[PDB]
Each structure stands twice: as C-alpha cells, then as structure tokens.
C-alpha cells in the first residue's frame, strides 16, 4: 500500500515540499513545545483528535530511532561505522520527523485550515524573485 | 512524555507484555494482511477510525527502519557493523512493531472489546505454570 | 488500459495473491469441474450470470493458448526452444488461469460473498502461528 | 466443451463468417476505438452490460498473448523459431481477436440487433456476383 | 499534466486522430473563417462560450509561432537552418493547429453534438478499407 | 482580428505592463504550482471556470514551444543557429507565457477582482520615486 502521511489531514507530501528543508525547527525544539503545551492531552487515555494520535505515534517512533542511535553508541566498536550511522539517524531520518512534528504541532496550535493556507502563502513568497520578495517571510500567529 | 501507545485504545504495555515472542506473525505477514484487507481505508483521504490513523503511522515508520537497514547494507563497509545494525532492526525493533501492527489489525478485524477480553484471558492462561495449564492456548475469534 | 479481471466482481489481483500459489488446483481439475457441474449453462444461448460470461471467455482463452502450445509441439523442430515455450505456457500463464478458473467456478458453486469471505479467512489462518489458530484449515461450504 | 463465444449474444461463428477475413480492421485500431469510446466503462467497478464483461476478458487475453510474444522475443535462443512463433500470434490468433473485438465494439456502438441485421445484409451483398453487385457495400453508421 | 485539449469538450486526441491530413483547410483559410464569422464575439469583453475562450487562445498562440518563423527568417543567417526551422513550424505544428482551429470553429458553426456524431461516423468510414468503403466520405452539415 | 489575451478577464495588455518583466516567476515555478494546486481540476473533462480553459490551452502551447526547442536540439547541426533559436524560445517567447501563466494561476488562487486591484496598487508603488517608495513591494496573499 502506498500511504501518504498527510492525505487524511487534507495535505500531501508535494504540498509540504513548498517549505525548504532548513525552514523547520530542530527535533528538540518541537518536542519541548509539545511537552510544554500538550503533555496533558498527549498522556490522556482518550482520543482528543486524530492530530493527537498521529503526534503520539511520531514521538514514540522518534524515541525508537534515538534508542537505536544510543545502542549503536554502546554496541558498535568501529568508530567510523558508528559515526556514519548516528549522522544518518539524526540528519537524514531527523528531517522527515522534523517536518511531521511541525505539521501536527502547528495544526493543534493554529488549526488545520490555517496551516494549509500558510503553505500556499509561503510557496508564493519563496517562488518570488528575492528582489520582488518581501524581506519578512510569512509566519504563523493566531 | 510518558506516552503509552495502547492507553488511548483501552490497553497498556503491561497488558500486551504477557504475549510471548512466538505469538505474533512476521512483519511481512502483518503488512501483507493490512494490504489484503484494508488498503482502500488506509490509502483513503478520510481517517476511517483512530485504529486506521494509528495503523498508517505504524506502516510508514517501519518503512524508514527498512530504509535504514537498506542504507546500512549499502553504505557501511565493515561487515561486523553492517550485520550487527541490520540484525538489531530485524529482531529487536521488529518485535515491538509486530506487536503494534498485530494489535491495530486485530481491533479492526474483531473489534476492540473482543481483543481486550482476549488479552485478559490469555494472561490467565500464560501465567499458569505448565503442570496445571490446559494444553491449547485461547484462540482469538468473532464470538 | 488498466483493467483488473476481478475488479468487476469485488476482488483484485492482490486479494487472490493473498492465498499461496500452491493452493490453487490444476487447470485440468478445474476444466473437469466446469464440464461436470455447469456444461448446460455454459453451452446455453442465455447470459445465465456475469460469472458464466466470464468463465466462457476464460475457457476459450486457455483453449487458444493450448492450441499455441500444441501447434508449437507439432511445428517446431528444435526440442529446446519447443520445451521453453510449452513450459512457459504451462507455468506462467498457468497460475493466472488457475486463480481465474478457481474464482469463477467457486462463485458459481458457493456464491461470491462466501468466496470473498473465504479468501480473507484462509489467508489470515495460513499466516497465524500454528499454536494459536484453530487446528484445521478453513474450507468452502454452503 | 464446444462453447461458441457468439451464442449468448444471438450470433454464431458461422454468421460472423459472412464477413471476409480482409474486412476486419487491425487489432491496434480496435483497441484504440475501445480506449476512445468506452475506457471509463471498461475500467469501471460495474457490470455495465454482458458486452462489457466479454470485451474486458478479450482485451486481457490479447494482452496475455502479446506478453507471450514479448517473452518469446526476449528469451528465445534461435531466430527461426522466434519469428515463426511471433508470426503465428500476430496472424492466426490475430484473426480470431480481430472478429471478437469488432463484434463487441460494434454492438456497444450501434446496438446488438443493428449488428445482427448488418451481418445478414452484408452476406447478401458479398454473395452477389460482382457483375450485378451494387457499388455501395453496407456500412454501420448514424444517419 | 496529462491535459487533453478536447477532453473538456466531450472528445479526445484519439477521436480526432482518425481525420486524415488532407481533411483540414489551411491555417490562412481557418483564420479567415474565424474573422469572417466570429470577430464581434472573439474581440468582445465577454467570454461568449468555452469554445470562444479556447478559440482566442488558439488564434493568439499561432501568431507567436508565425512571429518565431518571421524572426528565424530575419535573424538566422545560415540558409539550411533558416529553411528547416521555418518548414517545421509551417507543416508539423501547423497540422496540430489546423485540427484545433477546425474543431472549435465547427462546434461554433454546427453545434458540439453534431461534430461529435460526425467524428464517430467518419471514424467508421475511414477505418473501412477501400475495397468495401462507399466512394464519398461523410459530409459535416446542420442536419 | 486584433484579440487581447486579457479583455474577457477584465484586464488589458497595457494594464499588465505596470508589472516589470523581471517581477514574474520562471516558467518552471508557475507550472509546478499549477500541478501542485490544480492538476485535479486541469485534467477534469469539464469546464470548472474560463480561467481553467485558458490555463489548459497556455500549458499545451508551452509544451508545443518546448517540443520545437528540443527538436531543434536534435535536428539543427549548426550550433550557432541552434543556440540562437533556443535562446529566443526560452527568453523572448518565455516572457509572454510567464505573464499569462502568472495571471491565470493568480486568479484561481486569489480571485479575479483581487488581482486587478493588485495591478493598480503595484503600479502606484513602482511609479513612486524609490526614496518615497516603501521598502516592501505590494504582494498577493488571501
């Protein structure tokens, strides 16, 4: 089955590709905001919304990858192999999880229809020649 | 966050910890089963249910771990480290995903209440020592 | 053009591949079953059902492929090229026609909704570890 | 089992034999015509009509035979058998599919009764010796 | 995008592919006809119909290709390359625009349903080989 | 017949000339946004609006010019003639198509009356002496 991570939330992988890969906050920043604003709802034994379910799964899977990396720091004796693996898990794998955490956290904070409109607006801004592009990028707020 | 993957679905990691490692099908068998019975709901633009929501994220995140095992196979030169990292993904993380996939697929197939009464009853059977335990384990079914 | 032969009948090529390849009986057993149970309906001037229309076409298409294999058998002098072609018809078209004949013969015998439920049940049963499934395999019955 | 494919549609192989071998268009023209007029219905989840069901199986059986010819064109180890087997598919089985595709595409386009009266009408025309045969052969059309 | 220029107007590129290259008037004849019969609708601030909308874009975009052939004539020094590029625009792209202009002009002139029934009936005539085909092609008219 | 490409959409060639020729995004940028946001409506066998029809025609004509350029890359042996022709098709022809794609995409995204008001507002801004001109050019958003 070819499943898109955003289709049920009214988006698509190609739509979230309007954002550059350097736009997203680091994984530590997103997890600190998720614990500071939604820990009460995220530990809940109920479904608050589909976005909470998705975020719970994503956080547990990031924990899995982090455990892999820590276990490779403890179980791989060849330092070159070790370094390569950790770099991959935190850089190549980290970029996908960053994007996903961003999306789900931003839909809990600002609402889903607001974040989809923001992706179109930021696309129009980055598609503009920097000369004709505002010196302030679109940002999310209320 | 001390998040429990089963706590929003009426279960706990302790309730599922009673199932032995030989109880679950392989990842390939579970993924083939999710394809054969729920591809029209899984690839849908509609959530379907929180079980479908949770099953999409679980199918997608295994794919990356398969991509990590593929990348390790193709990019780590040293045979000992290549084999050791590929084995860790295949057995240790594979067991946690086998349990997670099995649970969601079974709640879609039999209903959540039936899987929860089954997990309780299987718990009583597996905690009983072999000298007093009935020879055949409980079977999960539509009742 | 992307027609699926089973799509019209509530199945797919993937849903018939959920059963192991060695499950399906031989083309001879299936053709003998059709010639025993449904000869009158198959040789009728009536559309008896879309399962009858589909099975009529499938018997004729296998008949041609057999004409091709027999004609190859009589008309090629080199036994190695002759064996390669007659083998490839007997094996590779063989599985596709064994699942197609089995599906339409079973739906005439047991009903479509029964055969669709059976595909799911047997495919789940064969994948369950043997200590935790009913001791005997599922079978088709009225 | 002597099944005649035309019998459930009110014809026979004998009634279609009124048309000469050189009458029927090429397979590519017939498949183009099916893709032009009835792709939506052919791709459909529905039993649109018995003519759709028959035309689906014919398109698939021709695709198989072209996969046979393509597999032969790749895998063989002798030119003489390769051309002989490929030419047999293109001509001998070709003439049978050129009449089955023509019959179902015509019945979908003009109605089955129009095509049955057309076969009888063209029979009278082609049976007439060319000294007394009128210059306008019968045709299927809207006018 | 796999956009079909005729798919929003009830047709396909396959349905129009049956017309032979000698069937269409020249670009100059088609452009003269669009001028002589629909200049008050074409130069209007109102859409008129999606056929008028599509016919304006088709008239304008040929003008640029005429401007490319004019610019090539005046700016490419080498005779072989000047002639070869001018010929490619005159014959090959000209044939696709002749068909596109002819279709829009005919749907304005006769109605879309009449052009679609005509394209079907002309298809039957041109697919019939010359030995059995009536001597005169079907004629497009107001019926 | 002298036809203006914008009259039926309530604009004019002279009104779109308020924008500089360096304001418009590249052809690749506009076609990526048209495929990301409207491919579903653009492949539709119906008229969604006149703007969709116009955009369909424009995209097919750009494909035509691109085919001309690729065929000149394959069929013209004199490299100087070849280079000249390709430069013209992508630079001189590309600027008109850029303008048109921009207009039609922007009217699907923001509405037609909003894009006409934007042309007047950007004209007032570029007509201002840079000293009295805001350091942020007008931009299109909701």
PDB file of N, CA, C and O in Angstrom, chain A residues 91-121:
ATOM      1  N   UNK A  91      20.301  13.181  10.966  1.00  0.00           N
ATOM      2  CA  UNK A  91      20.303  14.156   9.843  1.00  0.00           C
ATOM      3  C   UNK A  91      19.337  13.729   8.750  1.00  0.00           C
ATOM      4  O   UNK A  91      18.443  14.545   8.387  1.00  0.00           O
ATOM      5  N   UNK A  92      19.521  12.516   8.219  1.00  0.00           N
ATOM      6  CA  UNK A  92      18.648  12.038   7.143  1.00  0.00           C
ATOM      7  C   UNK A  92      17.262  11.637   7.662  1.00  0.00           C
ATOM      8  O   UNK A  92      16.256  12.101   7.128  1.00  0.00           O
ATOM      9  N   UNK A  93      17.216  10.848   8.740  1.00  0.00           N
ATOM     10  CA  UNK A  93      15.952  10.489   9.385  1.00  0.00           C
ATOM     11  C   UNK A  93      15.319  11.677  10.121  1.00  0.00           C
ATOM     12  O   UNK A  93      14.103  11.857  10.059  1.00  0.00           O
ATOM     13  N   UNK A  94      16.127  12.501  10.802  1.00  0.00           N
ATOM     14  CA  UNK A  94      15.662  13.667  11.549  1.00  0.00           C
ATOM     15  C   UNK A  94      14.852  14.657  10.708  1.00  0.00           C
ATOM     16  O   UNK A  94      13.817  15.139  11.167  1.00  0.00           O
ATOM     17  N   UNK A  95      15.234  14.943   9.456  1.00  0.00           N
ATOM     18  CA  UNK A  95      14.495  15.859   8.567  1.00  0.00           C
ATOM     19  C   UNK A  95      13.037  15.427   8.323  1.00  0.00           C
ATOM     20  O   UNK A  95      12.115  16.238   8.387  1.00  0.00           O
ATOM     21  N   UNK A  96      12.731  14.166   8.065  1.00  0.00           N
ATOM     22  CA  UNK A  96      11.322  13.706   7.905  1.00  0.00           C
ATOM     23  C   UNK A  96      10.503  13.945   9.181  1.00  0.00           C
ATOM     24  O   UNK A  96       9.369  14.549   9.118  1.00  0.00           O
ATOM     25  N   UNK A  97      11.043  13.551  10.329  1.00  0.00           N
ATOM     26  CA  UNK A  97      10.362  13.654  11.641  1.00  0.00           C
ATOM     27  C   UNK A  97      10.174  15.116  11.999  1.00  0.00           C
ATOM     28  O   UNK A  97       9.143  15.436  12.544  1.00  0.00           O
ATOM     29  N   UNK A  98      11.158  15.951  11.747  1.00  0.00           N
ATOM     30  CA  UNK A  98      11.008  17.410  11.919  1.00  0.00           C
ATOM     31  C   UNK A  98       9.760  17.857  11.170  1.00  0.00           C
ATOM     32  O   UNK A  98       8.839  18.317  11.833  1.00  0.00           O
ATOM     33  N   UNK A  99       9.688  17.647   9.861  1.00  0.00           N
ATOM     34  CA  UNK A  99       8.527  18.054   9.037  1.00  0.00           C
ATOM     35  C   UNK A  99       7.228  17.583   9.686  1.00  0.00           C
ATOM     36  O   UNK A  99       6.343  18.427   9.962  1.00  0.00           O
ATOM     37  N   UNK A 100       7.127  16.296   9.997  1.00  0.00           N
ATOM     38  CA  UNK A 100       5.871  15.716  10.548  1.00  0.00           C
ATOM     39  C   UNK A 100       5.467  16.348  11.884  1.00  0.00           C
ATOM     40  O   UNK A 100       4.269  16.768  12.027  1.00  0.00           O
ATOM     41  N   UNK A 101       6.411  16.465  12.815  1.00  0.00           N
ATOM     42  CA  UNK A 101       6.162  17.058  14.145  1.00  0.00           C
ATOM     43  C   UNK A 101       5.682  18.473  13.929  1.00  0.00           C
ATOM     44  O   UNK A 101       4.630  18.784  14.443  1.00  0.00           O
ATOM     45  N   UNK A 102       6.378  19.232  13.086  1.00  0.00           N
ATOM     46  CA  UNK A 102       5.988  20.615  12.769  1.00  0.00           C
ATOM     47  C   UNK A 102       4.533  20.598  12.373  1.00  0.00           C
ATOM     48  O   UNK A 102       3.735  21.141  13.125  1.00  0.00           O
ATOM     49  N   UNK A 103       4.180  19.876  11.326  1.00  0.00           N
ATOM     50  CA  UNK A 103       2.802  19.893  10.812  1.00  0.00           C
ATOM     51  C   UNK A 103       1.815  19.651  11.950  1.00  0.00           C
ATOM     52  O   UNK A 103       0.950  20.536  12.212  1.00  0.00           O
ATOM     53  N   UNK A 104       1.972  18.552  12.685  1.00  0.00           N
ATOM     54  CA  UNK A 104       0.947  18.142  13.686  1.00  0.00           C
ATOM     55  C   UNK A 104       0.869  19.142  14.839  1.00  0.00           C
ATOM     56  O   UNK A 104      -0.238  19.560  15.161  1.00  0.00           O
ATOM     57  N   UNK A 105       2.000  19.604  15.342  1.00  0.00           N
ATOM     58  CA  UNK A 105       2.021  20.615  16.430  1.00  0.00           C
ATOM     59  C   UNK A 105       1.326  21.879  15.937  1.00  0.00           C
ATOM     60  O   UNK A 105       0.432  22.315  16.637  1.00  0.00           O
ATOM     61  N   UNK A 106       1.664  22.383  14.748  1.00  0.00           N
ATOM     62  CA  UNK A 106       1.100  23.617  14.157  1.00  0.00           C
ATOM     63  C   UNK A 106      -0.409  23.500  13.932  1.00  0.00           C
ATOM     64  O   UNK A 106      -1.066  24.516  13.992  1.00  0.00           O
ATOM     65  N   UNK A 107      -0.942  22.310  13.675  1.00  0.00           N
ATOM     66  CA  UNK A 107      -2.407  22.119  13.475  1.00  0.00           C
ATOM     67  C   UNK A 107      -3.139  22.101  14.821  1.00  0.00           C
ATOM     68  O   UNK A 107      -4.302  22.456  14.833  1.00  0.00           O
ATOM     69  N   UNK A 108      -2.514  21.627  15.892  1.00  0.00           N
ATOM     70  CA  UNK A 108      -3.055  21.738  17.249  1.00  0.00           C
ATOM     71  C   UNK A 108      -3.074  23.191  17.738  1.00  0.00           C
ATOM     72  O   UNK A 108      -4.035  23.630  18.362  1.00  0.00           O
ATOM     73  N   UNK A 109      -2.032  23.953  17.420  1.00  0.00           N
ATOM     74  CA  UNK A 109      -1.863  25.337  17.866  1.00  0.00           C
ATOM     75  C   UNK A 109      -2.726  26.336  17.092  1.00  0.00           C
ATOM     76  O   UNK A 109      -3.429  27.130  17.708  1.00  0.00           O
ATOM     77  N   UNK A 110      -2.702  26.301  15.757  1.00  0.00           N
ATOM     78  CA  UNK A 110      -3.301  27.319  14.883  1.00  0.00           C
ATOM     79  C   UNK A 110      -4.560  26.866  14.136  1.00  0.00           C
ATOM     80  O   UNK A 110      -5.214  27.690  13.496  1.00  0.00           O
ATOM     81  N   UNK A 111      -4.913  25.582  14.199  1.00  0.00           N
ATOM     82  CA  UNK A 111      -5.984  24.971  13.407  1.00  0.00           C
ATOM     83  C   UNK A 111      -5.515  24.463  12.041  1.00  0.00           C
ATOM     84  O   UNK A 111      -4.586  24.996  11.439  1.00  0.00           O
ATOM     85  N   UNK A 112      -6.159  23.435  11.507  1.00  0.00           N
ATOM     86  CA  UNK A 112      -5.728  22.748  10.258  1.00  0.00           C
ATOM     87  C   UNK A 112      -5.894  23.592   8.993  1.00  0.00           C
ATOM     88  O   UNK A 112      -4.964  23.577   8.174  1.00  0.00           O
ATOM     89  N   UNK A 113      -7.010  24.303   8.836  1.00  0.00           N
ATOM     90  CA  UNK A 113      -7.300  25.115   7.627  1.00  0.00           C
ATOM     91  C   UNK A 113      -6.354  26.315   7.565  1.00  0.00           C
ATOM     92  O   UNK A 113      -6.027  26.709   6.451  1.00  0.00           O
ATOM     93  N   UNK A 114      -5.894  26.837   8.691  1.00  0.00           N
ATOM     94  CA  UNK A 114      -4.912  27.947   8.767  1.00  0.00           C
ATOM     95  C   UNK A 114      -3.529  27.510   8.294  1.00  0.00           C
ATOM     96  O   UNK A 114      -2.875  28.310   7.641  1.00  0.00           O
ATOM     97  N   UNK A 115      -3.104  26.289   8.591  1.00  0.00           N
ATOM     98  CA  UNK A 115      -1.736  25.780   8.287  1.00  0.00           C
ATOM     99  C   UNK A 115      -1.659  25.392   6.816  1.00  0.00           C
ATOM    100  O   UNK A 115      -0.575  25.510   6.242  1.00  0.00           O
ATOM    101  N   UNK A 116      -2.768  24.964   6.225  1.00  0.00           N
ATOM    102  CA  UNK A 116      -2.828  24.627   4.784  1.00  0.00           C
ATOM    103  C   UNK A 116      -2.750  25.919   3.976  1.00  0.00           C
ATOM    104  O   UNK A 116      -2.011  25.925   2.994  1.00  0.00           O
ATOM    105  N   UNK A 117      -3.456  26.972   4.388  1.00  0.00           N
ATOM    106  CA  UNK A 117      -3.418  28.301   3.737  1.00  0.00           C
ATOM    107  C   UNK A 117      -2.020  28.895   3.880  1.00  0.00           C
ATOM    108  O   UNK A 117      -1.587  29.553   2.942  1.00  0.00           O
ATOM    109  N   UNK A 118      -1.320  28.639   4.976  1.00  0.00           N
ATOM    110  CA  UNK A 118       0.049  29.146   5.229  1.00  0.00           C
ATOM    111  C   UNK A 118       1.041  28.526   4.259  1.00  0.00           C
ATOM    112  O   UNK A 118       1.998  29.205   3.918  1.00  0.00           O
ATOM    113  N   UNK A 119       0.855  27.267   3.893  1.00  0.00           N
ATOM    114  CA  UNK A 119       1.761  26.527   2.980  1.00  0.00           C
ATOM    115  C   UNK A 119       1.666  27.135   1.587  1.00  0.00           C
ATOM    116  O   UNK A 119       2.706  27.298   0.964  1.00  0.00           O
ATOM    117  N   UNK A 120       0.461  27.474   1.142  1.00  0.00           N
ATOM    118  CA  UNK A 120       0.234  28.144  -0.165  1.00  0.00           C
ATOM    119  C   UNK A 120       0.889  29.525  -0.150  1.00  0.00           C
ATOM    120  O   UNK A 120       1.638  29.809  -1.086  1.00  0.00           O
ATOM    121  N   UNK A 121       0.674  30.319   0.895  1.00  0.00           N
ATOM    122  CA  UNK A 121       1.200  31.702   1.055  1.00  0.00           C
ATOM    123  C   UNK A 121       2.723  31.733   1.109  1.00  0.00           C
ATOM    124  O   UNK A 121       3.293  32.674   0.567  1.00  0.00           O
TER     125      UNK A 121
END
